[PDB]
Amino acid sequence: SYTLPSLPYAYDALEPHFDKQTMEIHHTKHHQTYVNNANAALESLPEFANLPVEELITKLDQLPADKKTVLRNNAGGHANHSLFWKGLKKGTTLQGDLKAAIERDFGSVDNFKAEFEKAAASRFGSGWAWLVLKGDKLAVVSTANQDSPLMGEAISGASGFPIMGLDVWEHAYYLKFQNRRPDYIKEFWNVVNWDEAAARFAAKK
Amino acid sequence: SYTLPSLPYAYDALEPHFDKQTMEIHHTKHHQTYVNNANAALESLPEFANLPVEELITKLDQLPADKKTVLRNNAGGHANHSLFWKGLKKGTTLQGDLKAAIERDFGSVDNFKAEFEKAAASRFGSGWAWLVLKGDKLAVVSTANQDSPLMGEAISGASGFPIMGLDVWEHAYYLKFQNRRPDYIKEFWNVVNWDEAAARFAAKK
Ligand SMILES: [Mn+2]
Numbered sequence: 001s002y003t004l005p006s007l008p009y010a011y012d013a014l015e016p017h018f019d020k021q022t023m024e025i026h027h028t029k030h031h032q033t034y035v036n037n038a039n040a041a042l043e044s045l046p047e048f049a050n051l052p053v054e055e056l057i058t059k060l061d062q063l064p065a066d067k068k069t070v071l072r073n074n075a076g077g078h079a080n081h082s083l084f085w086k087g088l089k090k091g092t093t094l095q096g097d098l099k100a101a102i103e104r105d106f107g108s109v110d111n112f113k114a115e116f117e118k119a120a121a122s123r124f125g126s127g128w129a130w131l132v133l134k135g136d137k138l139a140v141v142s143t144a145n146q147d148s149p150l151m152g153e154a155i156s157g158a159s160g161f162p163i164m165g166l167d168v169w170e171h172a173y174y175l176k177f178q179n180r181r182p183d184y185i186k187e188f189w190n191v192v193n194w195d196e197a198a199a200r201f202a203a204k205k
Numbered sequence: 206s207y208t209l210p211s212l213p214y215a216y217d218a219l220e221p222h223f224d225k226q227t228m229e230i231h232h233t234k235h236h237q238t239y240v241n242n243a244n245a246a247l248e249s250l251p252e253f254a255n256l257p258v259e260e261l262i263t264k265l266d267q268l269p270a271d272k273k274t275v276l277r278n279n280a281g282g283h284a285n286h287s288l289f290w291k292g293l294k295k296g297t298t299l300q301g302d303l304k305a306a307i308e309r310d311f312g313s314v315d316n317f318k319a320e321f322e323k324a325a326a327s328r329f330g331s332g333w334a335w336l337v338l339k340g341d342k343l344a345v346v347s348t349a350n351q352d353s354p355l356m357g358e359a360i361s362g363a364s365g366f367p368i369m370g371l372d373v374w375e376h377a378y379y380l381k382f383q384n385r386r387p388d389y390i391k392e393f394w395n396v397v398n399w400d401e402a403a404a405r406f407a408a409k410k
């Protein structure tokens with residue numbers, strides 16, 4: 001069965017950038033609910049119930065048609081938030097191979113940040129902004145709702161291995177930022193965990 | 206040229222049910238942005254800028270490819286929010302006819318409420334729940350993002366003339382209700398404008 005993962009830090013660990021009230025609600029209510037809904041949907045499907053969630057979401061086309069959507073949404077949500085929590089940490093520095101890759105692919109760190117900010121800002125409605133690796137190269141893309149690039153292009157409109165991502169559902173920012181998503185996106189730069197992104201970049205799948 | 210309509214009441218006129226902080230931000234920031242972005246996109250389309258917004262979103266398939274998404278989203282947003290403001294008011298009572306296409310399609314007020322709450326709660330990500338008039342037949346439907354049943358099935362997954370509707374984008378309910386959308390949905394019952402809904406049940410068109 002899926003379970004809500006413990007966070008790697010306290011709910012106030014990302015202050016003063018992401019707010020503690022949101023962190024706590026986002027984890028204990030939003031994320032918990034994706035877990036609960038996915039488990040409920042997987043009760044009747046013992047062949048799928050047991051796989052890591054990162055695997056289940058690559059196999060959505062194999063599910064019964066009447067289970068496709070509920071698991072796309074909820075196993076997607078469980079996958080994405082699990083990555084998100086581990087992908088946030090204060091005090092990290094972009095450096096090494098990842099940094100060199102960003103500069104190579106976007107020309108500069110500032111162009112990369114610009115391109116991610118725009119992708120994050122223009123995702124209309126609920127969704128995610130991602131840094132993804134595919135074919136030796138970095139790119140920035142966004143997905144709808146809880147879709148992940150790991151689900152493939154047919155389903156998500158995106159593809160590749162996520163290196164890092166930012167939740168742009170309004171629940172992730174409305175308490176402190178209201179409508180000002182670009183402010184929330186700039187604050188992300190203060191808390192994106194570059195050590196974990198590097199580790200994913202080395203691993204590459 | 207679209208004009209942001211003024212609200213039919215003060216920001217606090219829906220208290221204690223819908224919060225005044227949200228009424229103000231929702232109108233002066235979110236609605237303002239939709240108007241702006243539809244207006245900007247319509248500047249090169251004097252052919253279409255003349256139509257009422259509610260007629261424009263019926264014609265999305267007649268726009269020039271690179272215009273369809275921007276106007277779907279933003280003309281949809283302007284249309285939906287304009288209806289939303291007029292469709293909110295305290296102190297009204299469902300009665301009279303607005304009960305006359307129901308129980309060949311619903312069977313009681315409480316049944317209809319239960320169907321409406323289902324659609325509102327089940328809408329995954331951003332969108333809207335609607336009471337629509339489909340020829341002869343009320344029905345409950347929901348749409349994604351700023352889609353409207355007025356855009357048709359092919360585009361919105363929905364159809365019918367909107368009688369009334371609830372905004373379930375998180376911005377509409379987060380500051381007061383956070384993740385508790387069902388508590389927000391319960392409150393909508395206390396502010397849904399049955400007089401305006403009844404009047405529309407007359408706009409049949
Ligand atoms: Mn989230």
Ligand SMILES: [Mn+2]
Binds near residue numbers: 286374376377
């Ligand atoms: Mn809204």
